Design a protein around this ligand. Sequence first.
Ligand code: BLA
Ligand code: BLA
Lengths: 739, 739
Amino acid sequence: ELSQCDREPIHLLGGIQAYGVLLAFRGPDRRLEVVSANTQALLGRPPEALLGKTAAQVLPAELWAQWELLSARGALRVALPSGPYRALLHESDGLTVLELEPAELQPDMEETALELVRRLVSPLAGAKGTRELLQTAANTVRALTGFDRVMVYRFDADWHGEVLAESKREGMDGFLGMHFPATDIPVQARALYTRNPLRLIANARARPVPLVPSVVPELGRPLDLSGSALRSVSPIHLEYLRNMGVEASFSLSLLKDGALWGLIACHHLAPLHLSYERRRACEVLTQLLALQLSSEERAAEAAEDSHRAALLGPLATSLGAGGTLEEALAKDGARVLELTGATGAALLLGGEPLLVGRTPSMDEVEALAAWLAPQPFQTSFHTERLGSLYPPLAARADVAAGLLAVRLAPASSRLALWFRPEAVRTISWAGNPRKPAEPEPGHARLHPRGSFQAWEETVRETSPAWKRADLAAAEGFRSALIGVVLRQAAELERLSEALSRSNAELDAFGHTVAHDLKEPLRGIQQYAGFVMEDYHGALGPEGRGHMESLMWLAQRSGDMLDGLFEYSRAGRVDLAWGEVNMQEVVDEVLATLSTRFQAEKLTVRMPRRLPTVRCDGIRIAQVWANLLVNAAKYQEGPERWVEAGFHGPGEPRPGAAGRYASAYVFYVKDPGIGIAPPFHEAIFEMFRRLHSAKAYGGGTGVGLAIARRLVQLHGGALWVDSAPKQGATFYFTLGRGPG
Amino acid sequence: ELSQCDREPIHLLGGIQAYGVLLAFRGPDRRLEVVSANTQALLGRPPEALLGKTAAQVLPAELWAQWELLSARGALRVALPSGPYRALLHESDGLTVLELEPAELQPDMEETALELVRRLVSPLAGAKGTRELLQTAANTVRALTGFDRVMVYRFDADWHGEVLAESKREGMDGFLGMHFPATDIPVQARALYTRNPLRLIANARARPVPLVPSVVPELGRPLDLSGSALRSVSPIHLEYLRNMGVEASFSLSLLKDGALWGLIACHHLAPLHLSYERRRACEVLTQLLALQLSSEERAAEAAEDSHRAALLGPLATSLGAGGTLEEALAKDGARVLELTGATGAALLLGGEPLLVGRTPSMDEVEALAAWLAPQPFQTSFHTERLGSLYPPLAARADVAAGLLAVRLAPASSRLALWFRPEAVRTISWAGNPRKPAEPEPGHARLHPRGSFQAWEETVRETSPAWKRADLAAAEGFRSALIGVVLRQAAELERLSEALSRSNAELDAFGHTVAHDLKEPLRGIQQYAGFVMEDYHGALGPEGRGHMESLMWLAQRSGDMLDGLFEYSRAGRVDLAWGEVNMQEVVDEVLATLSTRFQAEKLTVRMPRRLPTVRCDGIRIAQVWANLLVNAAKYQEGPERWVEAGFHGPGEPRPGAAGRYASAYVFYVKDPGIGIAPPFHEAIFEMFRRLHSAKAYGGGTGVGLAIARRLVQLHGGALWVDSAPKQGATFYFTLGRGPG
Ligand SMILES: */C=C/C1=C(C)C(=O)N/C1=C\C1=NC(=C\c2[nH]c(/C=C3/NC(=O)C(C=C)=C3C)c(C)c2CCC(=O)O)/C(CCC(=O)O)=C1C
Ligand SMILES: */C=C\C1=C(C)C(=O)N/C1=C\C1=NC(=C\c2[nH]c(/C=C3\NC(=O)C(C=C)=C3C)c(C)c2CCC(=O)O)/C(CCC(=O)O)=C1C
């Protein structure tokens, strides 16, 4: 920036303060080439003639008594006929630089300075907070320097700083709680202050002392004074101080690590000068303060992050505990809002967005959801001034001041949204930030602000800035728990509803079968009616036989259709508790399956007749037929047979049949392949088989389910004792029935 | 060797090191009550003869001049004819103790006070964590004082000592990693170290100087010396140092909120002296170190807890994705252990125990799991020592010294538990560097192999205490991982049986349509054979017609079955292409639905003649019938008329019909209520009706799905344009079919 401020060079102005004396040396010869003009008082010779001559006779002889140890160390206190002076040496631009300053006069303060500086570390420090540290540091600085006003200036990320602590004298004007514009500190000053910890300005009204010669012959520019301590500041800042009304200034820099955290500023109303040892004490004070501040801020950040993680966890615990995703989220919307300190939570799981708290209206929320897809961000996005970037939503910015968005899915429209409310803030400036300076004709300079009276700027459509902890919480919300639980909850809900539609379709199919089953009955009645009753004689023998075959085929088809309707259909399957001979039903089932038994080489074994029990004959016959079909379907042994019997009251029974102490336990045993004992309860399920569907001469697996349902409806249960290559025995328990 | 060690007092030894001088005063007149034996050299008078003598006479007038200043400040440097002599003053027990020590010969202008503070503090600009803080502090202290060895000791929970950081001169043995029992530093020593922050032993070989009189006349005990800094040392510690071969000692205490935390010890092989400025700087150094340590420990604990919480992140992310809990444990066996910092994880989820890392044998694990059940604990159990409580595992405590268990099932014996070995194999050996020295003392006091052996016996079969962070992490695991895995297993079983139910429903539909095609394969055959049964006019025409009617009914029944084959599934039939006129299909549909149109007062409108398209006649007729039924179902207007038209290639058509760029688009328009544009696609779903199922004379919601499926199978798509109270128009696009 080549504008009045940044364009002005520093550390090359060549201005020297009044009281100092400056000398330069180079090479082993150590001659004089850069000397100030105010040395005539000390040296007693024309400084212009003193340039280049033998230094061995220029400076007073008393200095050479400790010259070597001063060069070894860098600081020296020496008595002169004019008075006791302080001397420092430093190598700048490849040349030795010597300074002479009016030294201190009271030799009784240096020891007390240790006691004074001990007050910052203190028996008590930080027990009440960082504010205590700052105010104690300011008070100690003020007591040490003897100045009037001492303030602490903390820089911001935008390089416009504030003041935190303050120490005052009676009658002065305080500057607590004001914001100064970032233009007050140019880049050159920030660059310089990373290397020179402190500086002093004794007299604002004093004209800077020129340096002779004007420029260095081998450089063409005045010698750098960055490492020195007597450089005069640019007159623009002098005018700034004069307009402020102060007289003398003295500042130190707080370095966190290569970064200017802040300054310690001191002002005065009269000319005043400080000793070297006092400045060293203040430097040590700043060192200690910087150490403590860095440690405390690190601890605070770590504690905040740990607290946010330990708040993230319980959300996962609570979500896992519950079983109603939307309702569980609603009943603890405060927790998710506090997760990042927001007021509106919005969830996008591919369906209707979920809204909690102060949230934008629906139209706005899918307007935003449509957006943020064109905007490229790798994982997440966040902003405070949404209305500026998004004019459409700037209208109702009260509930949509600022936002944060996280890509819930890896790459989709599933986004999590946090909305902040409008926060009203006002800030004070010592002067008008809009006009940091007044231009002058020629644009060679920009005069500083004429006044620094309080001016109020009120911001609108703003919310507190996002903290790093908020970003960490959002990132830990995207994945690393909480994300897994809500992803799986959404999958669970959106597929459980699909399964609900699935059994709804199953019920619809059942109702369709129920209302269509009236057609086979009507067709069978029509086929039976008007035939074989009036035209039976006219049909002849062959006609009557063909009609009988047709009627038998129709009846068989109707019976098969009725049996296939094993579901609920129009009427749920039930049992009629009646005195029906179980032996007769078993014999009828065997006669019906006699052809299958002969084809499968299965012999019906009846060691004893099944006792009669109070149960439906049709249901008992169906259960027996299903059990026989299941036993003979997976029968591979050459000796295939089915043994049917029953254990009554007190009759011996195997362990599996003895599980239920029913009055009657009908057992059918076959020496087939059988099923695994774990699969014995599995085969009883609907359409469950231990072999391939197309194997064992085809199968459906619904017979075992029908038998189990019949047993359950009869007050008992069906248990199959089956072992690998050891045969199978299915026992069904018959209860007393309804009473 | 003396057992009277932890009880013997250090205050009342009545001894002062060789170089110092001590006087005691009492009363307003400041009489003499306690003096040392070195007063003869510095005063030139008999020691005991000065007791009870007036203060002004005995003490030289030089320190009398500064006596009030000495009382005010507390310390003062004063030159005496013999030489410089620093004076200290403090009130011990109602007796004012004055302290004279030989000040160093330096003229105090080499490295004055408050200057060493900067030298010590400057290298502490970094010090990211806590260990490097102590390391750098020890290094810079050894650089400043120049002592041979510097060590840092940290105290354990029960005052066990551990060497943390060592900064040593090259040449001697290193003691980094030591461990000594609490008995090596008695209670009185700890109290003294807490009280004052400095301790210095100038010479180990110096004989202590006695105190005359041997006891105070009044209190009956030797004068207190805790407040002072020249009290003698116990002979046992002198023997300790002599065996160690250490001459002078310098120790700085470390505090934390008033509780002792560690020590900084300095050892030298020869007597040495320290300037008082260095000591006065070291005091401030200790204060600053305590202030730093508090925040550093807080931040370290917070960061450790945060990392423990975040470790659940990747572990949870391992779940959810395809894998088993045991599988994740097997590959992530590494990450699990540092969740509690153990060497072995065991868990009993319901099957055989799972063991990862270092753990006892499986049978012992099962026995321990059985033994845990009687012990009453709600959720968490944990011991640092197991042999004291579990005798069976006491012998093999080397790998199972301590344990931490948490139950998984609320009531059942499902628990997960981490094992930690004894705190003697974890610690790296440091105590016995071999090369034993030539002297061989009793070595019960000699640290080499003397200590670190009692400590081994004191802590054998014991694990480091379960830190609160580890317990919190274990609780978080038990909560979150179980609350995730339970619903993960629920999801697994749920979609398993959902897929099973869907495929079983499809297979049952296929089997049922097979059965309901085989049944009419006999029914229609019987109906046809009934005609040939008569084979003559004997049956008569009318009766024969009845048979014909039955045949038609049979055919109708078959048609119904065919309808079922096209009802539940999308098409359940192979696609075909044929030259079937769309106008003929529309006319046939209108004629079939003529009764329905007359009953519902529906008028068939034909704005244009439907051309001929390459599509199946049956499929086109079914699609048209479904569209007409859907249009007439939701028709509530008085002038309810259905208009059927066709748009060819390049002809004007509605935008919805223009979605599919097909040659022909057949559109059916009705003035009924229609469906919402969002519900236009939802209505196309099978069994999806926007109104009540029983409303509008019943409904199924499968005709639109069938039409959409036919359109999709015909190389096109089916669209519906409808708005609330704006009619509806269903357009089906017909493609060119296969090439
Ligand atoms: C009968 C009691 C004691 C036995 C036990 C013993 O060995 N020392 C006993 C009393 C005191 N020890 C004091 C100082 C001290 N001792 C240790 C022990 C150590 N453990 C180690 O590993 C090492 C080094 C290898 C040592 C030296 C320490 C660490 C200390 C403090 C360090 C120091 O001040 O030098 C003591 C106080 C003496 C005093 O007045 O200063 C007593 C009493
Ligand atoms: C481009 C012109 C210009 C405008 C006017 C302006 O505000 N500053 C400026 C140029 C320079 N000012 C320099 C020095 C300087 N300014 C400040 C500002 C403050 N004084 C306070 O009391 C205070 C509060 C707290 C603030 C923010 C300060 C602190 C300085 C440093 C000098 C002091 O120690 O006071 C400057 C660099 C010259 C130099 O410092 O050597 C330029 C170029």
